[PDB]
Design a protein around this motif. Sequence first.
Motif, PDB file in Angstrom:
ATOM      1  N   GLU A  38       0.826  -1.202   0.000  1.00 22.53           N
ATOM      2  CA  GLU A  38       0.000   0.000   0.000  1.00 22.53           C
ATOM      3  C   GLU A  38       0.862   1.254   0.000  1.00 22.53           C
ATOM      4  N   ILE A  59       1.657   4.025  -3.442  1.00 20.98           N
ATOM      5  CA  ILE A  59       1.496   5.463  -3.262  1.00 20.98           C
ATOM      6  C   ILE A  59       2.748   6.194  -3.728  1.00 20.98           C
ATOM      7  N   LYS A  74       2.813   6.225  -7.552  1.00 22.55           N
ATOM      8  CA  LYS A  74       1.806   7.100  -8.143  1.00 22.55           C
ATOM      9  C   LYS A  74       2.178   8.568  -7.974  1.00 22.55           C
ATOM     10  N   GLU A  75       2.779   8.926  -6.839  1.00 23.37           N
ATOM     11  CA  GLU A  75       3.166  10.316  -6.627  1.00 23.37           C
ATOM     12  C   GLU A  75       4.409  10.695  -7.422  1.00 23.37           C
ATOM     13  N   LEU A  85       1.340  11.695   2.091  1.00 17.92           N
ATOM     14  CA  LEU A  85       0.539  10.494   2.231  1.00 17.92           C
ATOM     15  C   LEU A  85      -0.946  10.836   2.254  1.00 17.92           C
ATOM     16  N   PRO A  86      -1.792   9.963   1.712  1.00 17.28           N
ATOM     17  CA  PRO A  86      -3.237  10.202   1.771  1.00 17.28           C
ATOM     18  C   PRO A  86      -3.736  10.181   3.208  1.00 17.28           C
TER      19      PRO A  86
END
Lengths: 233, 335
Positions: free
Chosen positions: B6, B10, B13-14, B95-96
Amino acid sequence: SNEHYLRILTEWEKNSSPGEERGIAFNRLSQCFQNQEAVLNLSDLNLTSLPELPKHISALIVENNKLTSLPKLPAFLKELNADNNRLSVIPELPESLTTLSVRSNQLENLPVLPNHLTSLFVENNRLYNLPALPEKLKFLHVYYNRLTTLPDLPDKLEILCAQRNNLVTFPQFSDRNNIRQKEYYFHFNQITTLPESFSQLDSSYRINISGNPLSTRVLQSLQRLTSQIYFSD
Amino acid sequence: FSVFEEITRIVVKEMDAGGDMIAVRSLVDADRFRCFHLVGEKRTFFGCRHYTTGLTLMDILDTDGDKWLDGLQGQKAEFQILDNVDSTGELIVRLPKEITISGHHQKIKISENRISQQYLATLENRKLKRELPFSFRSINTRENLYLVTETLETVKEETLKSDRQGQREVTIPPNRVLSYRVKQLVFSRNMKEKLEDMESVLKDLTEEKRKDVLNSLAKCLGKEDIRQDLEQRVSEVLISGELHDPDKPLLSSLFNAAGVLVEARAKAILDFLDALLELSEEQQFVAEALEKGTLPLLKDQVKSVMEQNWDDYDPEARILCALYVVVSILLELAE
């Protein structure tokens, strides 16, 4: 002028807030001045402000603190690393500066940039606009900001990380950038259409434009021309 | 989907959403995803799988033309690695809202390593050995050999909590590779169509050969030792094209009536065994339904959910996908 500077440090040290470590900073600031050292490192000291800095230093490492502003930078500073602070403005930069690192602050503007600057890292700030770019610029990080446009790219720019902004157009590309591989990142912006400057762009250019509301039209044409390395997710 | 995977997706994708950056899915093989280390690839049903190796680029460089090596051979090679890797700087991943650092805008700091642009420019004229190390040439071909040219890694210990659905947590040690890039050293349909190609390949088998396959694959459910062994033996025969053997009925099913190995039959089995790897506790549902004759119910149940959410980027989809493939193939063999 030892007693002079030793006073300034003493007045600064006795003006502390309860959570700071101005005594450790006083020591490091003391040896740096008397030994005429080149690197002053005051990182991870909970500091909310800095005194007048020891002149003739080359690198100033003051990252991971609570600084809201920086004092007048030494006139021949080579590197500035103020990452992870609370700065809103950067003072005027010496023309000798080649590396500027001010990530994860609260900067809304940047001062004029010196010509010898080859690394500019200002990611995770609040910039709406970016000053003109130095000709000798090689690495530029401006992601996690609120920019909408970019200045003309220099002729030696190799890496450009401009993702996670609010860009609506591409900047003008250089006609004399003849280095091996350009890696330009523009993903997660608001770019809607592709410029005509993408023609006559060598395969030396690796561009990412994913996460961009590209129109179904320009998305369809890219789907053709791809049968410069581009990624259009 | 661990909290580690997970976190690494991330990062990708960033830093490079939709690019060639590949996330590390498991924390234990992260040390083999370093610059100059070699990575093997294979086309799978879900794309391509990235296999760690024990090799670096120095192991495959033909150095016979050089005169000065006849411990210097290991000293000269190790400096070629340490000198041509640059720490091009650090990066910030925000971070989300689900991720939280134990111990505000949540962020982690990662560090980049890249093979120098100068060294990469000379990679075209450096010569690779004709015979590759046996640990690789026995399971994969020379054109599937890749070079790790870039890595991203943590700079400090990071304890990250997740509530994506709870209280899932991972502690990433410092200097752990989270993502990487590969470069080829030498030189596609929709799911339903790729499964129909698989099922069409297996339909052309004789009755006995289809029962040898079904018997061997069923013994793989929930038993990773047998599945890893079967994947290794099927890969080796796909390369060698011969057979002498405990897995004799399955390997013999890859050959036609004339005795020629049908490579499509080996690839079809490998796609199955790789899809089984994407499943964990779900393999026990497949083994149960196969035991009680409710595989069709399990297939319709997976399909129904797949149609209801058409309204490991999505790890739930990857599970449903592997489930649909595994159950469909077993159902077809049992006809």
